[PDB]
Amino acid sequence: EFAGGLIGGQSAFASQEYNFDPLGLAEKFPEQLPFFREAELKHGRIAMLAWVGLVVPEFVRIPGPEKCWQASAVDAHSACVXXXXXXXXXXXXXXXXXXXXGALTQVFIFCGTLEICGTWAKMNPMGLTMENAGDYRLGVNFLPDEPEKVKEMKLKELKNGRLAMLAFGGAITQATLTGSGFPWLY
Amino acid sequence: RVPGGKRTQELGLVIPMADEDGLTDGQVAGLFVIALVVFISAMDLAKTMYNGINPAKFKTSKGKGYISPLVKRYIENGF
Amino acid sequence: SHAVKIYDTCIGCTLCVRACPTDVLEMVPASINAAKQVASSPRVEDCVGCKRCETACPTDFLSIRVYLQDNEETQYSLGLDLVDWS
Amino acid sequence: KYGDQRKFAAVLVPLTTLVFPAVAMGMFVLYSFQEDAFWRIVPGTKRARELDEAWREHPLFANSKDPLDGLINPDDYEKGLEEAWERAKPAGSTVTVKDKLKQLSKQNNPHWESWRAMS
Amino acid sequence: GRCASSRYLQVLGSIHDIECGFGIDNTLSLNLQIFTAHWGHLTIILIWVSSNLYHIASNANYSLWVKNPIPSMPIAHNIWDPHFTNSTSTPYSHTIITTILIAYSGIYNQLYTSGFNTINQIYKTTFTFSCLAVISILLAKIHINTHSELLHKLASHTSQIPSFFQLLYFLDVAISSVNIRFNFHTGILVGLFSIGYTGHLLDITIPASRAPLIHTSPSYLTFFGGLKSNTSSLYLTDIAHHHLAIGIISILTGHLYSSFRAALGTYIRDILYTSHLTHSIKSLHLALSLILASCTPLTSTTAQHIYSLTPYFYLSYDHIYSTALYVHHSYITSFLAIASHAHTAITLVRDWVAPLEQESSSKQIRIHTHKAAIISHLSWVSLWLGFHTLAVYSHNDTCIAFNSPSKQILIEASNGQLIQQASGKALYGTINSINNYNKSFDSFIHPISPGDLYVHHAIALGLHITVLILLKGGLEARGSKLMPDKMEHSFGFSCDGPGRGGTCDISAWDSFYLATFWMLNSNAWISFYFHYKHLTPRQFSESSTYLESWFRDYLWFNSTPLIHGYSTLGANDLSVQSWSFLLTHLAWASGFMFLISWRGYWQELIDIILYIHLKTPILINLWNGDIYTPLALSIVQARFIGLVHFSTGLILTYPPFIIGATS
Amino acid sequence: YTETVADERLFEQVYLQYTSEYLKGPLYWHPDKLQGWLPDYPGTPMIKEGKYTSHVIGNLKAFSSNELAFLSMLFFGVGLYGNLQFNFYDPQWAKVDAGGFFNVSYIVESFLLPISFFMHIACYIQRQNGK
Numbered sequence A: 001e002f003a004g005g006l007i008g009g010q011s012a013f014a015s016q017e018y019n020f021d022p023l024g025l026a027e028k029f030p031e032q033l034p035f036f037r038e039a040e041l042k043h044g045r046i047a048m049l050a051w052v053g054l055v056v057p058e059f060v061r062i063p064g065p066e067k068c069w070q071a072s073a074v075d076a077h078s079a080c081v082x083x084x085x086x087x088x089x090x091x092x093x094x095x096x097x098x099x100x101x102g103a104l105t106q107v108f109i110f111c112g113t114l115e116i117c118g119t120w121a122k123m124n125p126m127g128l129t130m131e132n133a134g135d136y137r138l139g140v141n142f143l144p145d146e147p148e149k150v151k152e153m154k155l156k157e158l159k160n161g162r163l164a165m166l167a168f169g170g171a172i173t174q175a176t177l178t179g180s181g182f183p184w185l186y
Numbered sequence B: 001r002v003p004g005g006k007r008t009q010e011l012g013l014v015i016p017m018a019d020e021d022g023l024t025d026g027q028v029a030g031l032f033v034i035a036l037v038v039f040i041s042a043m044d045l046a047k048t049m050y051n052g053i054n055p056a057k058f059k060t061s062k063g064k065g066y067i068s069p070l071v072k073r074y075i076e077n078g079f
Numbered sequence C: 001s002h003a004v005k006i007y008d009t010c011i012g013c014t015l016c017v018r019a020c021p022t023d024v025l026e027m028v029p030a031s032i033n034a035a036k037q038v039a040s041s042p043r044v045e046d047c048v049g050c051k052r053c054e055t056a057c058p059t060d061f062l063s064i065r066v067y068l069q070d071n072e073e074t075q076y077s078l079g080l081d082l083v084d085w086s
Numbered sequence D: 001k002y003g004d005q006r007k008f009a010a011v012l013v014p015l016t017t018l019v020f021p022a023v024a025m026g027m028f029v030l031y032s033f034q035e036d037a038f039w040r041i042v043p044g045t046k047r048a049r050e051l052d053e054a055w056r057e058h059p060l061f062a063n064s065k066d067p068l069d070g071l072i073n074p075d076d077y078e079k080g081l082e083e084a085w086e087r088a089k090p091a092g093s094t095v096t097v098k099d100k101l102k103q104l105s106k107q108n109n110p111h112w113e114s115w116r117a118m119s
Numbered sequence E: 001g002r003c004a005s006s007r008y009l010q011v012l013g014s015i016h017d018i019e020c021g022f023g024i025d026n027t028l029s030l031n032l033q034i035f036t037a038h039w040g041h042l043t044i045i046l047i048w049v050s051s052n053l054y055h056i057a058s059n060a061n062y063s064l065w066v067k068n069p070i071p072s073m074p075i076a077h078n079i080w081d082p083h084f085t086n087s088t089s090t091p092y093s094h095t096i097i098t099t100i101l102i103a104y105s106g107i108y109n110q111l112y113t114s115g116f117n118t119i120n121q122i123y124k125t126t127f128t129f130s131c132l133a134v135i136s137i138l139l140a141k142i143h144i145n146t147h148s149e150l151l152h153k154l155a156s157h158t159s160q161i162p163s164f165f166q167l168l169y170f171l172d173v174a175i176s177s178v179n180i181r182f183n184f185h186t187g188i189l190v191g192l193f194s195i196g197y198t199g200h201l202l203d204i205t206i207p208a209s210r211a212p213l214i215h216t217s218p219s220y221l222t223f224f225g226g227l228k229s230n231t232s233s234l235y236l237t238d239i240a241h242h243h244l245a246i247g248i249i250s251i252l253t254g255h256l257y258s259s260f261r262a263a264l265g266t267y268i269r270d271i272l273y274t275s276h277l278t279h280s281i282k283s284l285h286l287a288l289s290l291i292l293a294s295c296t297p298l299t300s301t302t303a304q305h306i307y308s309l310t311p312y313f314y315l316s317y318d319h320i321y322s323t324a325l326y327v328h329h330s331y332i333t334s335f336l337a338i339a340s341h342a343h344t345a346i347t348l349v350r351d352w353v354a355p356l357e358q359e360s361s362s363k364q365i366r367i368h369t370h371k372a373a374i375i376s377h378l379s380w381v382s383l384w385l386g387f388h389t390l391a392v393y394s395h396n397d398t399c400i401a402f403n404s405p406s407k408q409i410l411i412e413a414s415n416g417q418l419i420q421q422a423s424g425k426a427l428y429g430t431i432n433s434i435n436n437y438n439k440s441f442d443s444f445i446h447p448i449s450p451g452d453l454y455v456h457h458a459i460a461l462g463l464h465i466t467v468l469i470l471l472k473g474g475l476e477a478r479g480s481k482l483m484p485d486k487m488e489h490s491f492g493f494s495c496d497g498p499g500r501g502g503t504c505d506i507s508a509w510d511s512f513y514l515a516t517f518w519m520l521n522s523n524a525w526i527s528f529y530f531h532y533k534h535l536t537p538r539q540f541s542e543s544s545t546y547l548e549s550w551f552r553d554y555l556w557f558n559s560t561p562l563i564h565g566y567s568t569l570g571a572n573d574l575s576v577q578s579w580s581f582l583l584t585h586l587a588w589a590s591g592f593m594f595l596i597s598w599r600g601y602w603q604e605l606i607d608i609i610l611y612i613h614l615k616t617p618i619l620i621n622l623w624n625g626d627i628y629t630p631l632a633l634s635i636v637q638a639r640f641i642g643l644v645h646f647s648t649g650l651i652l653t654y655p656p657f658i659i660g661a662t663s
Numbered sequence F: 001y002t003e004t005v006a007d008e009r010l011f012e013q014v015y016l017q018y019t020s021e022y023l024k025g026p027l028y029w030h031p032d033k034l035q036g037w038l039p040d041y042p043g044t045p046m047i048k049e050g051k052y053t054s055h056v057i058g059n060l061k062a063f064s065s066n067e068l069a070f071l072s073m074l075f076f077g078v079g080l081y082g083n084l085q086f087n088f089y090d091p092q093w094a095k096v097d098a099g100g101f102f103n104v105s106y107i108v109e110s111f112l113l114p115i116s117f118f119m120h121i122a123c124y125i126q127r128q129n130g131k
């Protein structure tokens, strides 16, 4: 069985299986395949949200700390974190800014808390397997009750995630190279 | 002070003494309270180490024991 | 009390029995040597521990071995004279 | 003044270097005459017997002192040993495995741990 | 029947030998007792730290020493002794003021470097460390209860199958687990402790050493070198960066073994099984031996590098701190070094299972196969070093007594000089490629002379002989040609009788007893070398190739201030030093009789004395001797007591000399 | 028949030969037979036939010998390049001394030399087992 029987390896021309793995990592690391699918789904979801929030600020910009909330999508990370002391280290000597402190570290700490009580709580305490890889039981009531419908919905999630990962890479690289608007072209 | 040794006399090394008290009596008493706590706890620990483990507690002691869920994992993870 | 053990390599010298100053050892009949006799230590409670038996034993390594047990000493194993423990 | 801590010293030094040491020595010589004295290193104390029996009462440590503990199916082991000895038994030898093991387990050492008779 | 007077010595000789306990029946009890003892010992250490901090806070002058550290002297604690003169003034007090003692530990520089400025901070630190002692004792109680609760949970435990008894081996998996312990030690206890100390330095130590600066920016991590000019110590920025680097490296290393999950990390057993090891890692004596052998290089390098590269403020400016610290840590590491071998011998006696006769698989097996070759070659190198060091020293002594200093044999220390030249070229290349050059390294490289070569050969001789005695004891602990049953007996036992040639000092413990004298002698040589080179580098460089120089220009000459301490002319503040000097001489000589005179003489003497007591009118009607029968000390107890007296005398005779010579 | 010493020795030999084979089996359960003790872990035999089994190299057990050889040589080249370009050619010490920063590529690469050593060890181990 290819890659422990995970959704995502089936071709689209049907009657065929893309089972894309030129490096053969699925057979080299079968004990970390659930972690591989966890990472793939996490990257896909983060990249979907990242592409959406790479397009949107070109139109609407939340009015806030003017130090951030300004500039191109490229100059929006190092600007919305400011000259932190070393890296993601709050300046306790001068909280309330007045020189150097973060503006996203709140997003960072929220992501850390959610991740620890999310993936870490799923793996360390009293358990992830092949089937429950990306399944955090979030919005499963919306999932249809049919064996193939769930499988095709998961496949659509996976393929949208891969497309969003590649799309975000291309979009951010083009924006860095050129600037410009949504087309991200010279 | 009457110094001894060649270097103290030939260099003028001196030992200053504070004219104040150092610690007030209240601070010494505050330290002695926690020292007494250490002392009581250490006497209890010495008693427990002297008597050692009692395996026959399961015949008389209440409860049913407990193995923490991580201790079970550490048991079955290996040695 | 010490522990005096006799091993199969005994050849019935009787020298160990003769050297014992407190009559700990004795000769018993056996069939494992040409002498048809081996030593025995039926009264090691009287073994002071002088190890004269080990000095007298001529086998390659002593057929009689005395194991000292200092946390075990009795009045007989200490040779107490001025003091009685009974 | 730099002194005024000697008010603590004049009580503590005599106390902890005379009263406590003397009380400790008297308590130690009193403890030396208890039947429980040095029960962990001195053989033949009552508490040592009680502790050993308490360990033996635990279901895990019942057959803990037996050097042969571990044989999951001792009957299978004994049967296999008897079968292996039958094919190697010398000529008309009259020794069986059962009595051979029984007489190899029974030695004659009366003066071993005889200190388990006072406490 | 009951016991004799030797019961006290017999009990106290194994008072902490938890393996020899009578109630202890399993590794669970042994491991839990050891863990609780560890907790109590940590509590003792914390209370000792709080003690020093309190006495510096209360009975001391830290607030004044911090202002002018170079010429000032710290105070250890007050003197309250009713035996002094209630009149006049002692030489340890400024007339009517209280009596004080000068601290030679070095805690003042430690606290000053760490960022302490006020007495109040030291008081709060004392309170916190007493709190930590409470916490440690409570953790001991907690773990005793948790293990007893597991034991009680065996009242609701059964596998429904005969394999349930397997749980017997996993009850102490909390203590006996190795992979988790290694992972968490090397990661947390080493790397993250270093990283936390880097944080401490960046937040306090560097801020409280210079003018106010930026918000602890990454410019606080420097790569200067050593010996900041003003304080004559390492740069605090360099120390913080060093701890940061060590912390990062050890944190990365700590993810090696399979600690919490079975899917990450390699097992230590599999690591050893595919190497030249695969030892019995379940032995507690083996682990103790190989970690004592780890604290030994650490403590020896601590002694070397506290002096060579002084890390504390104004530590090099104290002529007594620098020698006392070095000698103290050298003695500590010598004790740990001999401990490693002693517990290796105990491991071989008690906790080592060997193949039948020929299976050369275990490392100890392969060592034991050719142990005679090891001991013979160690004896050869020891003999060579002793012969050729003593003979050259004798040549120098004789030819310099005969008015011929130029007839000496002075081998120039060429190899050490080459190593020093290479290191100096490397350091100078480092310095020359700096825009902030003109740095100093203090005594990292020192002038090396023929006297240095001879003393190094003497030190190598001492180390070789100590290792020879210890290694012979370890290898023949399980049986030698003289006594081919030594593993049937205890680790320490009296002898094997006067027959078979005579068998005094035959146990492995007797090998340790013999080796402790050589450990003390080698440490004395090392300490004499360091102290002599510290007192006068020039005179050591020239006149130290003949032993008469060591006897005269060091011992006889430098003992002048100490003996003059108390005399019929008045007393100095060295009076305690001279009195302790004489007391330690008495202690050293008192242990000679426990070593030279042996038991039987004294047993007859005790029989005569007991005859007197049972013959004295009143005593006989109150005390017949049947209860606690007085007996002469047993042979092993006698050897140990003589060794203790000898060690105490030899060790404690030196600090008075150090204080008299340097202060 | 009487039990001669030779017959007793024969019983000793028979008993030892039988029991030494029996105790290796699943029916003796000694603490020295636990995981982490003498016996190998259940699914991970380390040494068989006097040869390092494929399970020694851990997660690399599935790698081919050619893949490990290529990785070994590539890592050796990259790590040696990093070490030589950090120490002797293109030194970074002067650049970082004046307030600069290390060429992070050199630092990352230089750690691939011992990795390459163990990678080529693993390549040989894989080749021996025919993988």
Ligand code: CLA
Pocket (backbone or CB within 6 Å): E586, E589, E590, E591, E592, E593, E596, E597
């Ligand atoms: C300096 C080392 C030293 C010392 C102190 C002693 C002391 C002694 N030896 Mg001895 N001995 C030594 C080395 C020494 N030996 C050596 C190297 C050998 C070579 C083998 C011998 C061989 C030897 C033999 C063969 C004999 C002795 C005997 C004696 C005893 C007779 C002297 C006596 O009773 O005085 C009293 C003891 C003193 C130490 C005098 C000083 C006492 C102090 C200063 C006063 C009390 C202090 C005070 C109470 C403090 C309290 C303690 C504190 C904890 C509170 C005595 C206990 C003989 C004996 O026991 O016969 C009676 C005997 O037969 N010795």
Ligand code: CLA
Pocket (backbone or CB within 6 Å): A046, A047, A049, A050, A052, A053, A054, A056, A057, A060, A061, A062, A063, A068, A069, A070, A071, A072, A073, A076, A077, A080, A104
């Ligand atoms: C990977 C996702 C991601 C990341 C890292 C960022 C990061 C950033 N965004 Mg952004 N954004 C995103 C997605 C993301 N965005 C999406 C999906 C939208 C569309 C609503 C926007 C719309 C948006 C605007 C309008 C602006 C930013 C801005 C910024 C910058 C300042 C931070 C801020 O306040 O954002 C604000 C972001 C939001 C209010 C949208 C949050 C939506 C999150 C991603 C969904 C919640 C995820 C949660 C963990 C899952 C549970 C909920 C789920 C059921 C949906 C920062 C670089 C500001 C800036 O300076 O731009 C240059 C700004 O003005 N973003």
Ligand code: CLA
Pocket (backbone or CB within 6 Å): E376, E377, E379, E380, E383
């Ligand atoms: C035939 C004489 C002879 C020979 C060839 C050797 C050879 C050896 N001995 Mg040696 N030894 C000898 C006599 C001899 N020994 C005597 C008489 C003693 C008693 C003092 C020793 C005591 C001794 C010790 C304690 C050690 C050796 C060791 C060694 C070995 C290393 C070399 C060494 O240390 O030499 C140095 C030799 C000495 C220090 C001993 C003194 C040399 C004697 C005086 C020479 C006598 C020669 C003899 C008089 C010739 C007469 C010839 C005539 C009758 C025709 C080497 C195999 C060492 C070893 O085992 O390491 C591998 C070691 O540790 N030997």
Ligand SMILES: CC(=O)O[C@H]1CC(C)(C)C(=C=C/C(C)=C/C=C/C(C)=C/C=C/C=C(C)/C=C/C=C(C)/C=C/[C@@]23O[C@]2(C)C[C@@H](O)CC3(C)C)[C@](C)(O)C1
Pocket (backbone or CB within 6 Å): A048, A049, A051, A052, A138, A139, A140, A142, A160, A161, A163, A164, A166, A167, A168, A170, A171, A174, A182, A183, A184, A185
């Ligand atoms: C209680 C509760 O809540 O339950 C929850 C459960 C759950 C599951 C969390 C939920 C959900 C689902 C969610 C939130 C789904 C969101 C999905 C998103 C945002 C997908 C974006 C994909 C973007 C792509 C593919 C971009 C593709 C972009 C491409 C290909 C770009 C292509 C470009 O060529 C173009 C077009 C321009 C060129 O210049 C270059 C580039 C950029 C490459 C619910 C509904 O909330 C309910």
Ligand SMILES: CC1=C(C#C/C(C)=C/C=C/C(C)=C/C=C/C=C(C)/C=C/C=C(C)/C=C/[C@@]23O[C@]2(C)C[C@@H](O)CC3(C)C)C(C)(C)C[C@H](O)C1
Pocket (backbone or CB within 6 Å): A074, A075, A077, A078, A165, A166, A168, A169, A170, A172, A173, A176
């Ligand atoms: C830049 C910047 C920042 C940033 C950033 C970020 C997030 C940068 C992210 C970069 C990122 C995310 C880059 C992804 C690349 C993905 C690639 C190359 C995929 C190739 C995929 C290929 C070539 C696929 C090929 C195939 O399809 C082919 C042709 C046939 C198919 O049958 C099969 C396959 C699959 C084989 C900071 C640091 C945050 C702040 C700073 O201030 C500004």
Ligand code: SF4
Pocket (backbone or CB within 6 Å): C006, C009, C010, C011, C012, C013, C014, C015, C016, C017, C038, C039, C053, C056, C057, C058, C059, C062, C063, C064
């Ligand atoms: S001396 Fe030895 S060999 Fe002779 S009879 Fe006695 S025990 Fe046997």
Ligand code: SF4
Pocket (backbone or CB within 6 Å): C004, C019, C020, C021, C022, C023, C024, C025, C046, C047, C048, C049, C050, C051, C052, C053, C054, C066
């Ligand atoms: S040690 Fe002495 S008393 Fe004991 S059996 Fe031998 S000879 Fe007899």
